[PDB]
Design a protein around this motif. Sequence first.
Motif, PDB file in Angstrom:
ATOM      1  N   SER A   1       0.825  -1.202   0.000  1.00 19.18           N
ATOM      2  CA  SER A   1       0.000   0.000   0.000  1.00 19.18           C
ATOM      3  C   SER A   1       0.861   1.254   0.000  1.00 19.18           C
ATOM      4  N   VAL A   2       1.946   1.249   0.777  1.00 17.23           N
ATOM      5  CA  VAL A   2       2.888   2.364   0.734  1.00 17.23           C
ATOM      6  C   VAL A   2       3.480   2.494  -0.663  1.00 17.23           C
ATOM      7  N   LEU A   3       3.818   1.364  -1.285  1.00 20.60           N
ATOM      8  CA  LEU A   3       4.339   1.396  -2.648  1.00 20.60           C
ATOM      9  C   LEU A   3       3.274   1.846  -3.643  1.00 20.60           C
ATOM     10  N   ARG A   4       2.018   1.449  -3.426  1.00 19.46           N
ATOM     11  CA  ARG A   4       0.970   1.735  -4.400  1.00 19.46           C
ATOM     12  C   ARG A   4       0.566   3.204  -4.418  1.00 19.46           C
ATOM     13  N   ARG A   5       0.866   3.957  -3.359  1.00 13.97           N
ATOM     14  CA  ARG A   5       0.500   5.370  -3.332  1.00 13.97           C
ATOM     15  C   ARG A   5       1.279   6.168  -4.371  1.00 13.97           C
ATOM     16  N   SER A   6       2.545   5.820  -4.589  1.00 12.13           N
ATOM     17  CA  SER A   6       3.411   6.517  -5.530  1.00 12.13           C
ATOM     18  C   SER A   6       3.234   6.044  -6.967  1.00 12.13           C
ATOM     19  N   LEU A   7       2.095   5.429  -7.290  1.00  8.84           N
ATOM     20  CA  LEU A   7       1.935   4.801  -8.598  1.00  8.84           C
ATOM     21  C   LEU A   7       1.963   5.822  -9.729  1.00  8.84           C
ATOM     22  N   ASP A   8       1.361   6.996  -9.529  1.00 13.18           N
ATOM     23  CA  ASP A   8       1.283   7.977 -10.610  1.00 13.18           C
ATOM     24  C   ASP A   8       2.653   8.569 -10.930  1.00 13.18           C
ATOM     25  N   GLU A   9       3.394   8.975  -9.897  1.00 11.05           N
ATOM     26  CA  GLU A   9       4.726   9.527 -10.118  1.00 11.05           C
ATOM     27  C   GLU A   9       5.650   8.487 -10.736  1.00 11.05           C
ATOM     28  N   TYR A  10       5.588   7.249 -10.243  1.00 12.21           N
ATOM     29  CA  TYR A  10       6.382   6.187 -10.846  1.00 12.21           C
ATOM     30  C   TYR A  10       5.958   5.922 -12.283  1.00 12.21           C
ATOM     31  N   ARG A  11       4.670   6.083 -12.591  1.00 10.00           N
ATOM     32  CA  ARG A  11       4.204   5.874 -13.957  1.00 10.00           C
ATOM     33  C   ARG A  11       4.766   6.928 -14.900  1.00 10.00           C
ATOM     34  N   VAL A  12       4.749   8.196 -14.486  1.00  8.65           N
ATOM     35  CA  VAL A  12       5.321   9.233 -15.344  1.00  8.65           C
ATOM     36  C   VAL A  12       6.833   9.051 -15.463  1.00  8.65           C
ATOM     37  N   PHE A  13       7.487   8.608 -14.384  1.00  9.04           N
ATOM     38  CA  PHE A  13       8.919   8.339 -14.454  1.00  9.04           C
ATOM     39  C   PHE A  13       9.217   7.198 -15.417  1.00  9.04           C
ATOM     40  N   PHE A  14       8.390   6.153 -15.397  1.00  7.54           N
ATOM     41  CA  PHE A  14       8.575   5.034 -16.312  1.00  7.54           C
ATOM     42  C   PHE A  14       8.317   5.454 -17.751  1.00  7.54           C
TER      43      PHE A  14
END
Length: 112
Positions: free
Chosen positions: A70-83
């Motif tokens: 859940s802690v990892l899943r919160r940053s999904l949008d920023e990680y998506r733009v980074f990817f």
Amino acid sequence: NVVVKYPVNSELANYAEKFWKKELAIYNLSLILNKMTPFVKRRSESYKSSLSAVKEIFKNVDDFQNFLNSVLRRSLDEYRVFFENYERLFNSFSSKIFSMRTKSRLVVGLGD
RNA sequence: GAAUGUAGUAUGCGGUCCUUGCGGCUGAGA
């Protein structure tokens, strides 16, 4: 019961205590794992700062895994733009891109 | 024995190349 102590400075000690009890959301997994280490104390008169020891402060192992994800899943949008940016970096050079799934378990950087 | 002036140590130069944080360990004992 158990007693949890934090070797971090004041104020941040209480904030990290609130963070670990899921009172306040955490978005960065590396920060909470590294700079907010909980020193869980068992029946022994010592504060073991081991992953096995910090597992105890949860309901069980499944709760630990769910909280970490859940802690990892919160940053999904920023990680998506980074990817997306990283993939754009791949397309610049005439690179070859292939994708593989983890056939078995994988762990890198076990020795740091 | 008497009677200076003028003048940018500057021009060009990627702390880079080669290095798997790996090795070993029963979630088991009644």
